[PDB]
Design a protein around this nucleic acid. Structure first.
Ligand SMILES: [Mg+2]
Ligand SMILES: [Mg+2]
Ligand SMILES: [Mg+2]
Ligand SMILES: [Mg+2]
Ligand SMILES: [Mg+2]
Ligand SMILES: [Mg+2]
Ligand SMILES: [Mg+2]
Ligand SMILES: [Mg+2]
Ligand SMILES: [Mg+2]
Ligand SMILES: [Mg+2]
Ligand SMILES: [Mg+2]
Ligand SMILES: [Mg+2]
Ligand SMILES: [Mg+2]
Ligand SMILES: [Mg+2]
Ligand SMILES: [Mg+2]
Ligand SMILES: [Mg+2]
Ligand SMILES: [Mg+2]
Ligand SMILES: [Mg+2]
Ligand SMILES: [Mg+2]
Ligand SMILES: [Mg+2]
Ligand SMILES: [Mg+2]
Ligand SMILES: [Mg+2]
Ligand SMILES: [Mg+2]
Ligand SMILES: [Mg+2]
Ligand SMILES: [Mg+2]
Ligand SMILES: [Mg+2]
Ligand SMILES: [Mg+2]
Ligand SMILES: [Mg+2]
Ligand SMILES: [Mg+2]
Ligand SMILES: [Mg+2]
Ligand SMILES: [Mg+2]
Ligand SMILES: [Mg+2]
Ligand SMILES: [Mg+2]
Ligand SMILES: [Mg+2]
Ligand SMILES: [Mg+2]
Ligand SMILES: [Mg+2]
Ligand SMILES: [Mg+2]
Ligand SMILES: [Mg+2]
Ligand SMILES: [Mg+2]
Ligand SMILES: [Mg+2]
Ligand SMILES: [Mg+2]
Ligand SMILES: [Mg+2]
Ligand SMILES: [Mg+2]
Ligand SMILES: [Mg+2]
Ligand SMILES: [Mg+2]
Ligand SMILES: [Mg+2]
Ligand SMILES: [Mg+2]
Ligand SMILES: [Mg+2]
Ligand SMILES: [Mg+2]
Ligand SMILES: [Mg+2]
Ligand SMILES: [Mg+2]
Ligand SMILES: [Mg+2]
Ligand SMILES: [Mg+2]
Ligand SMILES: [Mg+2]
Ligand SMILES: [Mg+2]
Ligand SMILES: [Mg+2]
Ligand SMILES: [Mg+2]
Ligand SMILES: [Mg+2]
Ligand SMILES: [Mg+2]
Ligand SMILES: [Mg+2]
Ligand SMILES: [Mg+2]
Ligand SMILES: [Mg+2]
Ligand SMILES: [Mg+2]
Ligand SMILES: [Mg+2]
Ligand SMILES: [Mg+2]
Ligand SMILES: [Mg+2]
Ligand SMILES: [Mg+2]
Ligand SMILES: [Mg+2]
Ligand SMILES: [Mg+2]
Ligand SMILES: [Mg+2]
Ligand SMILES: [Mg+2]
Ligand SMILES: [Mg+2]
Ligand SMILES: [Mg+2]
Ligand SMILES: [Mg+2]
Ligand SMILES: [Mg+2]
Ligand SMILES: [Mg+2]
Ligand SMILES: [Mg+2]
Ligand SMILES: [Mg+2]
Ligand SMILES: [Mg+2]
Ligand SMILES: [Mg+2]
Ligand SMILES: [Mg+2]
Ligand SMILES: [Mg+2]
Ligand SMILES: [Mg+2]
Ligand SMILES: [Mg+2]
Ligand SMILES: [Mg+2]
Ligand SMILES: [Mg+2]
Ligand SMILES: [Mg+2]
Ligand SMILES: [Mg+2]
Ligand SMILES: [Mg+2]
Ligand SMILES: [Mg+2]
Ligand SMILES: [Mg+2]
Ligand SMILES: [Mg+2]
Ligand SMILES: [Mg+2]
Ligand SMILES: [Mg+2]
Ligand SMILES: [Mg+2]
Ligand SMILES: [Mg+2]
Ligand SMILES: [Mg+2]
Ligand SMILES: [Mg+2]
Ligand SMILES: [Mg+2]
Ligand SMILES: [Mg+2]
Ligand SMILES: [Mg+2]
Ligand SMILES: [Mg+2]
Ligand SMILES: [Mg+2]
Ligand SMILES: [Mg+2]
Ligand SMILES: [Mg+2]
Ligand SMILES: [Mg+2]
Ligand SMILES: [Mg+2]
Ligand SMILES: [Mg+2]
Ligand SMILES: [Mg+2]
Ligand SMILES: [Mg+2]
Ligand SMILES: [Mg+2]
Ligand SMILES: [Mg+2]
Ligand SMILES: [Mg+2]
Ligand SMILES: [Mg+2]
Ligand SMILES: [Mg+2]
Ligand SMILES: [Mg+2]
Ligand SMILES: [Mg+2]
Ligand SMILES: [Mg+2]
Ligand SMILES: [Mg+2]
Ligand SMILES: [Mg+2]
Ligand SMILES: [Mg+2]
Ligand SMILES: [Mg+2]
Ligand SMILES: [Mg+2]
Ligand SMILES: [Mg+2]
Ligand SMILES: [Mg+2]
Ligand SMILES: [Mg+2]
Ligand SMILES: [Mg+2]
Ligand SMILES: [Mg+2]
Ligand SMILES: [Mg+2]
Ligand SMILES: [Mg+2]
Ligand SMILES: [Mg+2]
Ligand SMILES: [Mg+2]
Ligand SMILES: [Mg+2]
Ligand SMILES: [Mg+2]
Ligand SMILES: [Mg+2]
Ligand SMILES: [Mg+2]
Ligand SMILES: [Mg+2]
Ligand SMILES: [Mg+2]
Ligand SMILES: [Mg+2]
Ligand SMILES: [Mg+2]
Ligand SMILES: [Mg+2]
Ligand SMILES: [Mg+2]
Ligand SMILES: [Mg+2]
Ligand SMILES: [Mg+2]
Ligand SMILES: [Mg+2]
Ligand SMILES: [Mg+2]
Ligand SMILES: [Mg+2]
Ligand SMILES: [Mg+2]
Ligand SMILES: [Mg+2]
Ligand SMILES: [Mg+2]
Ligand SMILES: [Mg+2]
Ligand SMILES: [Mg+2]
Ligand SMILES: [Mg+2]
Ligand SMILES: [Mg+2]
Ligand SMILES: [Mg+2]
Ligand SMILES: [Mg+2]
Ligand SMILES: [Mg+2]
Ligand SMILES: [Mg+2]
Ligand SMILES: [Mg+2]
Ligand SMILES: [Mg+2]
Ligand SMILES: [Mg+2]
Ligand SMILES: [Mg+2]
Ligand SMILES: [Mg+2]
Ligand SMILES: [Mg+2]
Ligand SMILES: [Mg+2]
Ligand SMILES: [Mg+2]
Ligand SMILES: [Mg+2]
Ligand SMILES: [Mg+2]
Ligand SMILES: [Mg+2]
Ligand SMILES: [Mg+2]
Ligand SMILES: [Mg+2]
Ligand SMILES: [Mg+2]
Ligand SMILES: [Mg+2]
Ligand SMILES: [Mg+2]
Ligand SMILES: [Mg+2]
Ligand SMILES: [Mg+2]
Ligand SMILES: [Mg+2]
Ligand SMILES: [Mg+2]
Ligand SMILES: [Mg+2]
Ligand SMILES: [Mg+2]
Ligand SMILES: [Mg+2]
Ligand SMILES: [Mg+2]
Ligand SMILES: [Mg+2]
Ligand SMILES: [Mg+2]
Ligand SMILES: [Mg+2]
Ligand SMILES: [Mg+2]
Ligand SMILES: [Mg+2]
Ligand SMILES: [Mg+2]
Ligand SMILES: [Mg+2]
Ligand SMILES: [Mg+2]
Ligand SMILES: [Mg+2]
Ligand SMILES: [Mg+2]
Ligand SMILES: [Mg+2]
Ligand SMILES: [Mg+2]
Ligand SMILES: [Mg+2]
Ligand SMILES: [Mg+2]
Ligand SMILES: [Mg+2]
Ligand SMILES: [Mg+2]
Ligand SMILES: [Mg+2]
Ligand SMILES: [Mg+2]
Ligand SMILES: [Mg+2]
Ligand SMILES: [Mg+2]
Ligand SMILES: [Mg+2]
Ligand SMILES: [Mg+2]
Ligand SMILES: [Mg+2]
Ligand SMILES: [Mg+2]
Ligand SMILES: [Mg+2]
Ligand SMILES: [Mg+2]
Ligand SMILES: [Mg+2]
Ligand SMILES: [Mg+2]
Ligand SMILES: [Mg+2]
Ligand SMILES: [Mg+2]
Ligand SMILES: [Mg+2]
Ligand SMILES: [Mg+2]
Ligand SMILES: [Mg+2]
Ligand SMILES: [Mg+2]
Ligand SMILES: [Mg+2]
Ligand SMILES: [Mg+2]
Ligand SMILES: [Mg+2]
Ligand SMILES: [Mg+2]
Ligand SMILES: [Mg+2]
Ligand SMILES: [Mg+2]
Ligand SMILES: [Mg+2]
Ligand SMILES: [Mg+2]
Ligand SMILES: [Mg+2]
Ligand SMILES: [Mg+2]
Ligand SMILES: [Mg+2]
Ligand SMILES: [Mg+2]
Ligand SMILES: [Mg+2]
Ligand SMILES: [Mg+2]
Ligand SMILES: [Mg+2]
Ligand SMILES: [Mg+2]
Ligand SMILES: [Mg+2]
Ligand SMILES: [Mg+2]
Ligand SMILES: [Mg+2]
Ligand SMILES: [Mg+2]
Ligand SMILES: [Mg+2]
Ligand SMILES: [Mg+2]
Ligand SMILES: [Mg+2]
Ligand SMILES: [Mg+2]
Ligand SMILES: [Mg+2]
Ligand SMILES: [Mg+2]
Ligand SMILES: [Mg+2]
Ligand SMILES: [Mg+2]
Ligand SMILES: [Mg+2]
Ligand SMILES: [Mg+2]
Ligand SMILES: [Mg+2]
Ligand SMILES: [Mg+2]
Ligand SMILES: [Mg+2]
Ligand SMILES: [Mg+2]
Ligand SMILES: [Mg+2]
Ligand SMILES: [Mg+2]
Ligand SMILES: [Mg+2]
Ligand SMILES: [Mg+2]
Ligand SMILES: [Mg+2]
Ligand SMILES: [Mg+2]
Ligand SMILES: [Mg+2]
Ligand SMILES: [Mg+2]
Ligand SMILES: [Mg+2]
Ligand SMILES: [Mg+2]
Ligand SMILES: [Mg+2]
Ligand SMILES: [Mg+2]
Ligand SMILES: [Mg+2]
Ligand SMILES: [Mg+2]
Ligand SMILES: [Mg+2]
Ligand SMILES: [Mg+2]
Ligand SMILES: [Mg+2]
Ligand SMILES: [Mg+2]
Ligand SMILES: [Mg+2]
Ligand SMILES: [Mg+2]
Ligand SMILES: [Mg+2]
Ligand SMILES: [Mg+2]
Ligand SMILES: [Mg+2]
Ligand SMILES: [Mg+2]
Ligand SMILES: [Mg+2]
Ligand SMILES: [Mg+2]
Ligand SMILES: [Mg+2]
Ligand SMILES: [Mg+2]
Ligand SMILES: [Mg+2]
Ligand SMILES: [Mg+2]
Ligand SMILES: [Mg+2]
Ligand SMILES: [Mg+2]
Ligand SMILES: [Mg+2]
Ligand SMILES: [Mg+2]
Ligand SMILES: [Mg+2]
Ligand SMILES: [Mg+2]
Ligand SMILES: [Mg+2]
Ligand SMILES: [Mg+2]
Ligand SMILES: [Mg+2]
Ligand SMILES: [Mg+2]
Ligand SMILES: [Mg+2]
Ligand SMILES: [Mg+2]
Ligand SMILES: [Zn+2]
Lengths: 204, 131, 16, 118, 122, 59
RNA sequence: CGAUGUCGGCUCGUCGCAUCCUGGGGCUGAAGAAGGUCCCAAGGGUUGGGCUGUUCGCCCAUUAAAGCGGCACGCGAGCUGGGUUCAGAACGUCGUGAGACAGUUCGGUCUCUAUCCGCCACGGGCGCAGGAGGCUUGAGGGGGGCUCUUCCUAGUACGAGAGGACCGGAAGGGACGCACCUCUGGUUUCCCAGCUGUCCCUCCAGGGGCAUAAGCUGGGUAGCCAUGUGCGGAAGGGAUAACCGCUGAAAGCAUCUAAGCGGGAAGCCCGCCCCAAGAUGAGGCCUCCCACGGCAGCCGGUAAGGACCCGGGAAGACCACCCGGUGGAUGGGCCGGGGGUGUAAGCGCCGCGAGGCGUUGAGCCGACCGGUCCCAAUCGUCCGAGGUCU
RNA sequence: GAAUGCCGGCAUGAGUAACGAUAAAGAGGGUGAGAAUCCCUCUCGCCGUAAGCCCAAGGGUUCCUACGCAAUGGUCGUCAG
RNA sequence: CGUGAGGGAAAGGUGAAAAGAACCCCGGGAGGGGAGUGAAAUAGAGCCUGAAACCGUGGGCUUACAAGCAGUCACGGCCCC
């Protein structure tokens, strides 16, 4: 189960065998390992990865001692890849070669307070034929005296997006080790500049 | 990082410079590699370009022609490797960047609006006097 | 409407 | 949503907001310093910085561009002849905003000064 | 992007002149038809003494659409009308000529006779 | 609508529990490095007119 | 009856299973294919249209299928108001009449503010025996769960022929779901241009206002988007249902069963995706501070840290979250690039003139990718451990 | 102790809805204990078969000036019918 | 209030005596703090007595794993006499 931290940079399309393949480009490595979770010590198996160098003038003493025991420069993000134990002490884009398939996890874009039609694709109301101030309204939310309440999990308005999303089984179209670049076919959650996690796929 | 530069870096392998410059209003012949049945030929599509939307490597352009009584618009990626070559056939002088208005015009109404870009025609003939 | 005069509850505005 | 959008709205429609910025431009470029609300102050910076920059360029085209917003020919003369030369070697940043420590009594609005720099 | 109520010109000599889609024959509930897709249609306008007359329920394959259609090579193509060719249950054209260009997507979907009878295949 | 309305008078306990979030927070004040008066940070001093070390406005 | 709003539609679901389809079966008057009938199964699915207020129903075109019921004939403090159902009017009919008719006909007021429970979201407080900054385990929840066509096997098995498979293997779809903006296609309230009338600046030229909350028109970046793009349903393991066995008595035979052991569903449990230690059963790991001064307690000064304030942010109603605060590229300006518009003004030349040509892809130029300390994040303040007991 | 009782007082809803045409504002300078709101100047916008002017009815000192701001003014007020 | 006929309120109390608080202080004023009057000033004119709802300040006890017509019975803890 290989994985690596990265930043989404943006999308384009390349040409491969007279086909245009939409790609999103990810700057993955290099990811130093700063702690290993062992079954003896922690109860599971994972690597805590670091990513992106940080101004030591910004890193407090508790964190600075965590990096010290690792022998690692201060870094902006720590994330674990579960069930991943790399041989080296540095993980780079070259753990993927073109043709492989990955799952990419990001923070989706945040719509704030989303109405019922954007959040849940409700049908709204009519826009004429007498419709009275309910054009984007959700309609009924229940029954009557039985059960005289509203189901937990009822689809209603509220905050939407800015949440963890994994999109799965993305073809790795290319890797450019010289630049820590990772091209992947399709779309990836979140904005340009967002932090993403790239993991070997769980589909078969 | 510089995210814009990295994307330009990714695209650089695919950028083309062999193709000639043109402008909306220019009549043009795109020699294009199509696949049919089992083999691949080169099909020419000749028409007026009515639009050039620019996004660097991702720029595309739209070419309009009338075929056997029917309007046909074709959108090409400017850096597509399926484009063998582009022949300028004529230079027209447009007044605006997008020429959708010619869709609702007769053949003579178009000829009156898009007259020969005499200036850039002389620029073409002045070039190709390279010796 | 209840409202008008065939029914008489739940359904229209002030008049009384 | 509002993602990556530039430009305050200031609860004015399109033509009122443009009038709002032009009138502060005239007042700032007349008195060298004015007091407004902090949000208005912050938006003024850009609008006047561009006018001053054109004054630094000095050509007739620049003057006519500046005239579209400022209108007053005398005022444009002051900007071209007396204001712009103060900034010949300044790479932008011809205005500053500093926050005032008290508010309006009648609506609690937070106040600021916008002034031309030296 | 043809759907029920959509009018289409007939690009053949079956005698039909205008047909109005009433089904896109693509599974349980397809919303739209594109080039290559078969529709059921009512013949709203036909020339006298043709093979088909007004009011007939016919089948037809869509050959040109005004919505542009995209291609794996990154290009697209778009026509100035929506046009169809009337067919029989073996997908063969019911007339003997077809008029105007047709989209190359027909060849893939298996409408070989229409492609060859077409004056231009774009 | 059908004009919703409070079912029961709110108890003294409940009305006051609603207001457990209403206390003002005191103004945040720093000493002015020039005249030592207490003033809001990041504002020109209203007592002596100084900011960033220099005189900026008439008091 | 000091009011429990009355049909239907729309919207939003959710449940039952007497199952319409899809999955698994036994019997068949099951050759194959396709049916019939019964059993198991509620995971998911169950189209668009013409008529009518209609529910229902009939009909058209499709489909794997176009299921039946409950939830106050689900749902009017969610909408509608066609029907029903006041007052007007008329027809047929009844009545001498006034009037009357689950008979018909045309018309006919549907109430801005949610206290409590519930529901969707988001915080504040305290707690989790020292106080802190990080990274996590997943108890327990939730989401999802669909299906078709063609081809190969193979024109094989089967059948006189017509027709035509099981098993196994490929390819391509429909609807739905999540994310996304490279492309396609929208918007793009001032990013650019053209245009009319009028008033104005300053007479010409050049401009500004107003004509909408853009005067109108042609375009249009980022963003937000679907019509566009990627990806999903699984696979796989386990335990089962009907059903089929192995071995096997009671009962010398027989029996799937009484001892024991197999096989076996789209369903059940895992697996996938998301939430999650207020999981008070308050978990775990890494790192940091530490024995402060005064009579499980008190008041103070601090430690590690945090907050306040400020510059902001594809984060956001406020709050929260995230980044930055001069040892700084956080916003604003400026510069370069991108992008849009499509050749500014001024001048020169041709024309009586409207205009035209050149200077010139010029000029203008939001957000996008960057650089640059020019401007502003000055200066600071206040909280904050000394660790209860066998 | 109850009469949807009568009179009065005070609560709840709640710091909630609202503050009455979407013609629109900005700065500077004054006055003052106090100013988004009063005065003055400049800029901006709105009406212009009126949102300008003159009669009639109705109203009845609301007119002018000085001095005032408790209440009236949907905020404020140094201003004002 | 109603065009009119006509309908039709609310509102009493300083003290024996104004001796009704000079003067000083903060405040623009209102208001208060001293001084002073009085047997009495929570008799200070918003004045005899001054109940209740209602609102607030201070203190004791108590409360953030808990199911409630709010009480009642028991025991325990803390506080007070
Ligand atoms: Mg982009
Ligand atoms: Mg490649
Ligand atoms: Mg970061
Ligand atoms: Mg992200
Ligand atoms: Mg992440
Ligand atoms: Mg986000
Ligand atoms: Mg999105
Ligand atoms: Mg909605
Ligand atoms: Mg939607
Ligand atoms: Mg959305
Ligand atoms: Mg959605
Ligand atoms: Mg959602
Ligand atoms: Mg709808
Ligand atoms: Mg609909
Ligand atoms: Mg709609
Ligand atoms: Mg509407
Ligand atoms: Mg209505
Ligand atoms: Mg409504
Ligand atoms: Mg409406
Ligand atoms: Mg609703
Ligand atoms: Mg009810
Ligand atoms: Mg109901
Ligand atoms: Mg219940
Ligand atoms: Mg959020
Ligand atoms: Mg998700
Ligand atoms: Mg795949
Ligand atoms: Mg790189
Ligand atoms: Mg980019
Ligand atoms: Mg032509
Ligand atoms: Mg011309
Ligand atoms: Mg020319
Ligand atoms: Mg009523
Ligand atoms: Mg929104
Ligand atoms: Mg909006
Ligand atoms: Mg920005
Ligand atoms: Mg703007
Ligand atoms: Mg507003
Ligand atoms: Mg407003
Ligand atoms: Mg306003
Ligand atoms: Mg407002
Ligand atoms: Mg306007
Ligand atoms: Mg001044
Ligand atoms: Mg001011
Ligand atoms: Mg202001
Ligand atoms: Mg000049
Ligand atoms: Mg400009
Ligand atoms: Mg400041
Ligand atoms: Mg302040
Ligand atoms: Mg005030
Ligand atoms: Mg006020
Ligand atoms: Mg034709
Ligand atoms: Mg024909
Ligand atoms: Mg005929
Ligand atoms: Mg006919
Ligand atoms: Mg593509
Ligand atoms: Mg035909
Ligand atoms: Mg041919
Ligand atoms: Mg309503
Ligand atoms: Mg209403
Ligand atoms: Mg109401
Ligand atoms: Mg009640
Ligand atoms: Mg109560
Ligand atoms: Mg109480
Ligand atoms: Mg209380
Ligand atoms: Mg409460
Ligand atoms: Mg209290
Ligand atoms: Mg509140
Ligand atoms: Mg407080
Ligand atoms: Mg009743
Ligand atoms: Mg009642
Ligand atoms: Mg009742
Ligand atoms: Mg009632
Ligand atoms: Mg009721
Ligand atoms: Mg059953
Ligand atoms: Mg059952
Ligand atoms: Mg049965
Ligand atoms: Mg079945
Ligand atoms: Mg079956
Ligand atoms: Mg069977
Ligand atoms: Mg038999
Ligand atoms: Mg048979
Ligand atoms: Mg069979
Ligand atoms: Mg089911
Ligand atoms: Mg169920
Ligand atoms: Mg069902
Ligand atoms: Mg139907
Ligand atoms: Mg009809
Ligand atoms: Mg209908
Ligand atoms: Mg019906
Ligand atoms: Mg019914
Ligand atoms: Mg019926
Ligand atoms: Mg019938
Ligand atoms: Mg079937
Ligand atoms: Mg069937
Ligand atoms: Mg039902
Ligand atoms: Mg029932
Ligand atoms: Mg149902
Ligand atoms: Mg019933
Ligand atoms: Mg009934
Ligand atoms: Mg009902
Ligand atoms: Mg129903
Ligand atoms: Mg209603
Ligand atoms: Mg109803
Ligand atoms: Mg109902
Ligand atoms: Mg209801
Ligand atoms: Mg109701
Ligand atoms: Mg109700
Ligand atoms: Mg009605
Ligand atoms: Mg009606
Ligand atoms: Mg009706
Ligand atoms: Mg009827
Ligand atoms: Mg009669
Ligand atoms: Mg009789
Ligand atoms: Mg009789
Ligand atoms: Mg009679
Ligand atoms: Mg009746
Ligand atoms: Mg009747
Ligand atoms: Mg009836
Ligand atoms: Mg009858
Ligand atoms: Mg009858
Ligand atoms: Mg009737
Ligand atoms: Mg009738
Ligand atoms: Mg009518
Ligand atoms: Mg009626
Ligand atoms: Mg209303
Ligand atoms: Mg509430
Ligand atoms: Mg309740
Ligand atoms: Mg908190
Ligand atoms: Mg909390
Ligand atoms: Mg602990
Ligand atoms: Mg600890
Ligand atoms: Mg410890
Ligand atoms: Mg922490
Ligand atoms: Mg953090
Ligand atoms: Mg976890
Ligand atoms: Mg679990
Ligand atoms: Mg729980
Ligand atoms: Mg589960
Ligand atoms: Mg579920
Ligand atoms: Mg399933
Ligand atoms: Mg075969
Ligand atoms: Mg075989
Ligand atoms: Mg044979
Ligand atoms: Mg055969
Ligand atoms: Mg098979
Ligand atoms: Mg579903
Ligand atoms: Mg979605
Ligand atoms: Mg997006
Ligand atoms: Mg883009
Ligand atoms: Mg786009
Ligand atoms: Mg586009
Ligand atoms: Mg502009
Ligand atoms: Mg004009
Ligand atoms: Mg004009
Ligand atoms: Mg002129
Ligand atoms: Mg004007
Ligand atoms: Mg006007
Ligand atoms: Mg206007
Ligand atoms: Mg209009
Ligand atoms: Mg304009
Ligand atoms: Mg436009
Ligand atoms: Mg457009
Ligand atoms: Mg755009
Ligand atoms: Mg875009
Ligand atoms: Mg979007
Ligand atoms: Mg779509
Ligand atoms: Mg098994
Ligand atoms: Mg046997
Ligand atoms: Mg046996
Ligand atoms: Mg057994
Ligand atoms: Mg077994
Ligand atoms: Mg077996
Ligand atoms: Mg499945
Ligand atoms: Mg089951
Ligand atoms: Mg988590
Ligand atoms: Mg915990
Ligand atoms: Mg956790
Ligand atoms: Mg917590
Ligand atoms: Mg528990
Ligand atoms: Mg506990
Ligand atoms: Mg505990
Ligand atoms: Mg514990
Ligand atoms: Mg813990
Ligand atoms: Mg653990
Ligand atoms: Mg410190
Ligand atoms: Mg903010
Ligand atoms: Mg916030
Ligand atoms: Mg905020
Ligand atoms: Mg910070
Ligand atoms: Mg600092
Ligand atoms: Mg700091
Ligand atoms: Mg910066
Ligand atoms: Mg910058
Ligand atoms: Mg800003
Ligand atoms: Mg450029
Ligand atoms: Mg360009
Ligand atoms: Mg020119
Ligand atoms: Mg020029
Ligand atoms: Mg010129
Ligand atoms: Mg001349
Ligand atoms: Mg010209
Ligand atoms: Mg340009
Ligand atoms: Mg510029
Ligand atoms: Mg530029
Ligand atoms: Mg700019
Ligand atoms: Mg760029
Ligand atoms: Mg950036
Ligand atoms: Mg530097
Ligand atoms: Mg300080
Ligand atoms: Mg009694
Ligand atoms: Mg009551
Ligand atoms: Mg009574
Ligand atoms: Mg009473
Ligand atoms: Mg009373
Ligand atoms: Mg009363
Ligand atoms: Mg009363
Ligand atoms: Mg009284
Ligand atoms: Mg009362
Ligand atoms: Mg009261
Ligand atoms: Mg109370
Ligand atoms: Mg109250
Ligand atoms: Mg009250
Ligand atoms: Mg209140
Ligand atoms: Mg509030
Ligand atoms: Mg409320
Ligand atoms: Mg509110
Ligand atoms: Mg209100
Ligand atoms: Mg409000
Ligand atoms: Mg109002
Ligand atoms: Mg008003
Ligand atoms: Mg109006
Ligand atoms: Mg107003
Ligand atoms: Mg309006
Ligand atoms: Mg107007
Ligand atoms: Mg101004
Ligand atoms: Mg002002
Ligand atoms: Mg003013
Ligand atoms: Mg002023
Ligand atoms: Mg002043
Ligand atoms: Mg001064
Ligand atoms: Mg004022
Ligand atoms: Mg004042
Ligand atoms: Mg005003
Ligand atoms: Mg004035
Ligand atoms: Mg001025
Ligand atoms: Mg006039
Ligand atoms: Mg007058
Ligand atoms: Mg008179
Ligand atoms: Mg009067
Ligand atoms: Mg006066
Ligand atoms: Mg007053
Ligand atoms: Mg006042
Ligand atoms: Mg006053
Ligand atoms: Mg007075
Ligand atoms: Mg008075
Ligand atoms: Mg008042
Ligand atoms: Mg007032
Ligand atoms: Mg008022
Ligand atoms: Mg005064
Ligand atoms: Mg007066
Ligand atoms: Mg009166
Ligand atoms: Mg009366
Ligand atoms: Mg009177
Ligand atoms: Mg009376
Ligand atoms: Mg009385
Ligand atoms: Mg009294
Ligand atoms: Mg007395
Ligand atoms: Mg006495
Ligand atoms: Mg005194
Ligand atoms: Mg004084
Ligand atoms: Mg004094
Ligand atoms: Mg005064
Ligand atoms: Mg006094
Ligand atoms: Mg006092
Ligand atoms: Mg006194
Ligand atoms: Mg005495
Ligand atoms: Mg005595
Ligand atoms: Mg006293
Ligand atoms: Mg007393
Ligand atoms: Mg007394
Ligand atoms: Mg009293
Ligand atoms: Mg007495
Ligand atoms: Mg008393
Ligand atoms: Mg009293
Ligand atoms: Mg008392
Ligand atoms: Mg107390
Ligand atoms: Mg206390
Ligand atoms: Mg518990
Ligand atoms: Mg406790
Ligand atoms: Mg009791
Ligand atoms: Mg008890
Ligand atoms: Mg006991
Ligand atoms: Zn100071």
């Amino acid at each position: 189960m290989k994985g690596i931290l990265g930043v989404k940079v943006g999308m384009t399309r390349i040409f491969r065998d007279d086909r245009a393949v939409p790609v999103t480009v990810i700057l993955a490595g290099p990811c130093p390992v700063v702690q290993r979770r062992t079954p003896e010590k922690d109860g599971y198996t994972a690597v805590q990865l670091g990513f992106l160098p940080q101004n030591p003038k910004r890193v407090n003493r508790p964190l600075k001692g965590h990096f010290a025991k690792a022998g690692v420069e201060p870094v902006r993000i720590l994330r674990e890849i579960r069930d991943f134990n790399p041989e080296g002490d540095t993980v780079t884009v070259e753990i993927f070669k073109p043709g492989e398939r990955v799952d990419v996890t990001g923070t989706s874009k945040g719509r704030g307070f989303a109405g019922v039609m954007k959040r849940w694709n409700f049908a709204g109301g009519p826009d004429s034929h007498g419709a009275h101030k309910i054009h984007r309204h959700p309609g009924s939310i229940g029954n009557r005296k039985t059960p005289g309440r509203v189901y937990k999990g009822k689809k209603m308005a509220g905050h939407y997006g800015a949440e963890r999303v994994t999109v799965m089984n993305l073809e790795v179209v290319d890797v450019i080790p010289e630049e820590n670049l990772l091209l992947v076919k399709g779309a990836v959650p979140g904005p340009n500049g967002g932090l993403v996690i790239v993991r070997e796929t769980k589909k078969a | 990082m510089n995210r814009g530069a990295l994307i330009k870096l990714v695209e650089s392998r695919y950028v083309r410079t062999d193709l000639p410059e043109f402008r909306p209003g220019d009549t043009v012949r795109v020699s294009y590699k199509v696949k049919e049945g089992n083999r691949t030929r080169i099909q020419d599509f000749e028409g007026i370009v009515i639009r050039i939307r620019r996004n660097g490597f991702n720029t595309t352009f739209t070419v309009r022609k009338v075929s056997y009584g029917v309007g046909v618009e074709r959108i090409f990626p400017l850096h597509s490797p399926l484009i063998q070559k582009i022949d300028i056939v004529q230079r027209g002088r447009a007044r605006r960047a997008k020429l959708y208005f010619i869709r609702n015009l007769s053949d003579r109404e178009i000829r009156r609006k898009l007259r020969a870009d005499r200036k850039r025609i002389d620029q073409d003939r002045a070039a190709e006097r390279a010796a | 409407s209840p409202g008008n005069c065939a029914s008489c509850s739940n359904s229209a505005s002030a008049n009384c | 949503m509002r993602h990556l959008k530039s430009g305050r709205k200031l609860n004015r429609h399109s033509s009122h907001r443009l009038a709002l910025y032009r009138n502060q431009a005239k007042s700032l470029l007349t008195h060298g310093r004015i007091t407004t609300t902090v949000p208005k102050a912050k938006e003024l910076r850009g609008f006047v910085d561009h006018l001053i920059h054109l004054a630094k360029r000095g050509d007739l085209h620049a003057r006519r561009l500046v005239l579209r917003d400022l209108q007053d020919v005398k005022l444009v003369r002051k900007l071209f002849d007396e204001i712009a030369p103060r900034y010949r070697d300044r790479q932008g940043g011809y205005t500053r905003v500093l926050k005032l420590a008290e508010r309006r009594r009648g609506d609690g609005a937070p106040l600021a000064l916008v002034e031309l720099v030296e | 992007m043809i759907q029920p109520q959509t009018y289409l010109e007939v690009a053949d000599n079956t005698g039909a002149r205008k047909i109005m889609c009433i089904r896109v024959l693509k599974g349980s509930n397809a919303k739209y038809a594109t080039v290559g897709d078969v529709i059921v249609a009512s013949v709203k306008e036909a020339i006298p003494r043709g093979a088909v007359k007004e009011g007939d329920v016919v089948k037809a394959v869509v050959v040109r659409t005004k919505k542009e259609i995209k291609r794996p090579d990154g290009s697209a193509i778009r026509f100035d009308d929506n046009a169809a060719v009337i067919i029989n249950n073996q997908l063969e054209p019911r007339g003997t000529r077809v008029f105007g260009p047709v989209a190359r997507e027909l060849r893939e979907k298996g409408f070989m006779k229409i492609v060859s009878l077409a004056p231009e295949v774009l | 609508a059908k004009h919703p309305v409070p079912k029961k008078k709110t108890s003294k306990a409940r009305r006051d529990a609603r207001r457990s979030h209403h206390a003002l927070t005191p103004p945040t004040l720093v000493p002015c490095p020039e005249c030592k008066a207490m003033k809001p940070p990041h504002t020109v001093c209203p007592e002596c007119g100084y900011y960033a070390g220099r005189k900026v406005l008439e008091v």
